[PDB]
Amino acid sequence: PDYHEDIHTYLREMEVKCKPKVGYMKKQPDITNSMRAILVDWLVEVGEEYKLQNETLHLAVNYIDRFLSSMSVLRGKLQLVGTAAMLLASKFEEIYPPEVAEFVYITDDTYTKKQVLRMEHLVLKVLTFDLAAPTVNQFLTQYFLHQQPANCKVESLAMFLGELSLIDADPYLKYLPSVIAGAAFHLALYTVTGQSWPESLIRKTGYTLESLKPCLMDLHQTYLKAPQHAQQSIREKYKNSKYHGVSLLNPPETLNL
Amino acid sequence: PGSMENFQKVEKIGEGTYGVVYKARNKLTGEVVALKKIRLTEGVPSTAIREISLLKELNHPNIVKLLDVIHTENKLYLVFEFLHQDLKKFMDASALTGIPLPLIKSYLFQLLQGLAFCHSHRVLHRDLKPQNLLINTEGAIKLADFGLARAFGVPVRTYTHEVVTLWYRAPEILLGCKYYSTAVDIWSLGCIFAEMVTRRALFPGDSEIDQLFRIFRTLGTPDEVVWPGVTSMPDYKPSFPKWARQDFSKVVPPLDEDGRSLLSQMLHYDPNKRISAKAALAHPFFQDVTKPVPHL
Numbered sequence: 001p002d003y004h005e006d007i008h009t010y011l012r013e014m015e016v017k018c019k020p021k022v023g024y025m026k027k028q029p030d031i032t033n034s035m036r037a038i039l040v041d042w043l044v045e046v047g048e049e050y051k052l053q054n055e056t057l058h059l060a061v062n063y064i065d066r067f068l069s070s071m072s073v074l075r076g077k078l079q080l081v082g083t084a085a086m087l088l089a090s091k092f093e094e095i096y097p098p099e100v101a102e103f104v105y106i107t108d109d110t111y112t113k114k115q116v117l118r119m120e121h122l123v124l125k126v127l128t129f130d131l132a133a134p135t136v137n138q139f140l141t142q143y144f145l146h147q148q149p150a151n152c153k154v155e156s157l158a159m160f161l162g163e164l165s166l167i168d169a170d171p172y173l174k175y176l177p178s179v180i181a182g183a184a185f186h187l188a189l190y191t192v193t194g195q196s197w198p199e200s201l202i203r204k205t206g207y208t209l210e211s212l213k214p215c216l217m218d219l220h221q222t223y224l225k226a227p228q229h230a231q232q233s234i235r236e237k238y239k240n241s242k243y244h245g246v247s248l249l250n251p252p253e254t255l256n257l
Numbered sequence: 258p259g260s261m262e263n264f265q266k267v268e269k270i271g272e273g274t275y276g277v278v279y280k281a282r283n284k285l286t287g288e289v290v291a292l293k294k295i296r297l298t299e300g301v302p303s304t305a306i307r308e309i310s311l312l313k314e315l316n317h318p319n320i321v322k323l324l325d326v327i328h329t330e331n332k333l334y335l336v337f338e339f340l341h342q343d344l345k346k347f348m349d350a351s352a353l354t355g356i357p358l359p360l361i362k363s364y365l366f367q368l369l370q371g372l373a374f375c376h377s378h379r380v381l382h383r384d385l386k387p388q389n390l391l392i393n394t395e396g397a398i399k400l401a402d403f404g405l406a407r408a409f410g411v412p413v414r415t416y417t418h419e420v421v422t423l424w425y426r427a428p429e430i431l432l433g434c435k436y437y438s439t440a441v442d443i444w445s446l447g448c449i450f451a452e453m454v455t456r457r458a459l460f461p462g463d464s465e466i467d468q469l470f471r472i473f474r475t476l477g478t479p480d481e482v483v484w485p486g487v488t489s490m491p492d493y494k495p496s497f498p499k500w501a502r503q504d505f506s507k508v509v510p511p512l513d514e515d516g517r518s519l520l521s522q523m524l525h526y527d528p529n530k531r532i533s534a535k536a537a538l539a540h541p542f543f544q545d546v547t548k549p550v551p552h553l
């Protein structure tokens with residue numbers, strides 16, 4: 001609270017430096033956005049099974065996107081990239097990271113422990129060890145401090161929305177985490193309480209409903225079409241009482257902007 | 258960024274739970290470095306992954322500089338700038354002379370600077386003690402050993418409970434607080450500040466409860482007045498002896514009024530009242546701060 005601004009400022013600077021290449025999928029010969037949605041959905045499953053932090057999952061997705069931004073990968077190796085990213089994310093963020101054997105186990109023994117570790121090494125190289133990336137989650141928790149008063153359904157809905165964005169490279173790869181965080185927070189706050197992006201977050205972030213609008217429009221459609229999405233692990237996850245079953249809430253029909 | 262081809266080992270320096278440290282000379286540039294070797298069956302250790310990534314973000318005069326990472330088959334070599342010794346060694350050597358107050362003031366000022374920087378970049382050190390503060394022959398002191406460090410969030414989550422070397426561990430960790438923060442690093446510096454003045458540790462406990470009791474006998478046993486929420490902390494006990502707080506001037510007798518003021522703020526029981534590294538920089542204790550060079 002004596003560093004909240006310093007840290008926000010710093011994270012805002014770093015999210016630009018840690019941003020994936022917006023159009024990297026066009027340059028991927030073998031893989032597609034849909035395959036990526038499949039991998040990310042699975043990573044949510046893995047997160048649940050090992051009770052990993054949400055932050056860990058966000059980090060792992062940051063690592064995958066940044067890696068695939070400079071390295072071509074065949075579809076048969078995409079999961080290996082993902083496994084190693086989750087492993088690294090876990091090592092970075094978790095009090096007790098699942099052991100390597102456990103990661104080797106959840107890939108249905110598609111890959112050897114030796115491959116998983118070699119890929120870990122390669123990922124570190126390609127990211128030059130820059131793992132402390134800003135995430136939607138990091139911005140959300142700061143934004144939550146501006147509630148009056150705090151509302152658990154809103155935080156869980158926001159988390160849920162922020163998390164849905166990880167699935168679809170198109171279009172969310174073009175929005176910075178701090179912006180998806182803002183869109184998610186306003187959408188959750190509106191859905192649950194009917195209120196809006198608070199004046200105090202405008203002072204803090206410089207973002208307005210107007211600047212958020214483009215991301216907000218996408219995220220709104222994502223929210224509306226969620227039950228029809230091919231990938232369903234985030235909705236299953238947020239049916240849980242841990243997150244106040246917010247996936248079961250009804251999305252607003254109109255945002256009115 | 259090259260390979261070990263250009264490094265010439267000069268001598269071993271010491272060891273870590275993961276690393277072996279050598280003094281080395283770059284043969285083309287003449288630069289003296291400290292090489293930390295990390296041998297690699299669970300892949301790259303988490304501590305090494307934290308240390309490298311956080312350290313690459315922290316470029317500061319009072320943070321030890323990671324110069325390079327040589328990442329090979331079975332070996333990970335971290336290349337650090339070379340510093341001459343640690344604060345612990347210096348205090349020992351300064352046995353009978355004592356450390357001149359202007360040099361204490363200087364070191365503390367510098368340490369608050371490096372620390373404020375860490376906290377400004379959402380990093381907790383979590384292992385500040387004289388063994389991890391390195392000094393050079395030009396008056397600088399720098400935080401080192403970011404193996405226990407952690408990237409934190411706002412507001413903090415629950416992180417590893419088993420943190421900070423015992424003598425320098427904050428009461429909120431001892432009492433099982435689910436949510437410690439930057440204040441734990443300030444607690445540690447408070448202990449180091451007192452230690453530089455007396456040249457003996459301030460709370461040399463041999464166990465957790467011994468550590469708590471030693472703290473309590475010095476600062477008074479905390480109650481809901483001095484520290485709201487204390488009695489509902491997990492490892493707090495109603496049977497705790499209730500000691501009076503002693504006059505702070507007896508805690509570190511050689512310290513002047515400004516020094517005492519500052520020390521007391523760094524050792525406030527309530528993490529929320531405990532002064533931040535940032536705010537401490539502006540304390541009157543530092544009004545005449547300079548940068549003396551120490552003695553070999």
Ligand SMILES: C/N=c1\[nH]c(C)c(-c2nc(Nc3ccc(C)c(S(=O)(=O)N4CCOCC4)c3)ncc2C#N)s1
Binds near residue numbers: 321337343401
């Ligand atoms: C695990 N401990 C260390 N890791 C690194 C990278 C260290 C370091 N060392 C120096 N130079 C230096 C030279 C001589 C001595 C005696 C000392 S020491 O007093 O701190 N000493 C005490 C006994 O254990 C070994 C180290 C340090 N410079 C930079 C770094 C860094 N980073 S220490």
